[PDB]
């Protein structure tokens, strides 16, 4: 199964870099917990932003612009990315915007962090039809001394499909 995992500010703005508009170590812990021991697929922009393989995960980089780094697995299409993961229970797609857009139709689960921040960026999470999904988990957290903004974790499972997403 393929899942997407993303942190969304207002207007579905995402940030892949370390310098995110927000500082949410709680969200990074959520990300790590839900991706550990699973393959992660990302585009090259996200790869360069992370800047080292995510430990404890197979790192697959989708790009028609492959780099040379031998520490990760480079693939040239969505289908090839999926094949490179093989027979695992769950493949995690970790962005960025265009990669999420291409993988959404193949995904059956979303792990979202809805962050109460309005921000400057222009990269967005894809459009999805909310009536196509069931919200099977949600948990709101207030900001605290370690986490700059309030946020709500959510897990959605797909119930319906309308082809483009
Ligand atoms: N929920 C969520 N939050 C994010 O911040 C996020 C996301 N999903 N999906 C893709 C994405 C792309 N950017 C990044 C940037 C850095 C790391 C990273 O360094 N992760 C470490 C955690 C570091 C820590 O323990 O504080 C890891 O091992 O996962 C991951 C993804 N970021
Ligand atoms: Cl990317
Ligand atoms: Mg090589
Ligand atoms: Mg299987
Ligand atoms: Mg800008
Ligand atoms: Mg825009
Ligand atoms: Mg899009
Ligand atoms: Mg779309
Ligand atoms: Mg409070
Ligand atoms: Mg229904």
UniProtKB/Swiss-Prot annotation:
CC annotations in GO: cytosol
Annotated EC: 1.5.1.3
Swiss-Prot/TrEMBL keywords: NADP, One-carbon metabolism, Oxidoreductase
SUPFAM superfamilies linked: Dihydrofolate reductase-like
Domain DHFR positions: 1-158
Pfam (any one): DHFR_1
Pathway(s) it belongs to: Cofactor biosynthesis; tetrahydrofolate biosynthesis; 5,6,7,8-tetrahydrofolate from 7,8-dihydrofolate: step 1/1
Domain of life where this protein originates: Bacteria
GO terms classed as biological process: dihydrofolate metabolic process; folic acid metabolic process; one-carbon metabolic process; tetrahydrofolate biosynthetic process
Cysteine disulfide links: none
PANTHER family (UniProt xref): DIHYDROFOLATE REDUCTASE
Family (UniProt): Belongs to the dihydrofolate reductase family.
Full protein name: Dihydrofolate reductase
Native source organism of the sequence: Escherichia coli O6:H1 (strain CFT073 / ATCC 700928 / UPEC)
Gene name linked to the record: folA
């Amino acid at each position: 199964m393929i899942s997407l995992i993303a942190a969304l500010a207002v207007d579905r703005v995402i940030g892949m870099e370390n310098a995110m508009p927000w500082n949410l170590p709680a969200d990074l812990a959520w990300f790590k917990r839900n991706t550990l021991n699973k393959p992660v697929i990302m585009g090259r922009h996200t790869w360069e932003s992370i800047g080292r393989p995510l430990p404890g995960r197979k790192n697959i980089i989708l790009s028609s612009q492959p780099g040379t780094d031998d520490r990760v697995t480079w693939v040239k299409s969505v289908d090839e990315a999926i094949a490179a993961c093989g027979d695992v229970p769950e493949i995690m797609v970790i962005g960025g915007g265009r990669v999420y857009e291409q993988f959404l139709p193949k995904a059956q689960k979303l792990y979202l962090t809805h962050i109460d921040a309005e921000v400057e960026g222009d990269t967005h999470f894809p459009d999805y039809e909310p009536d196509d999904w069931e919200s099977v988990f949600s948990e709101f957290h207030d900001a605290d001394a370690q986490n700059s903004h309030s946020y709500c974790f959510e897990i959605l499972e797909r119930r319906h499909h309308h082809h483009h997403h």
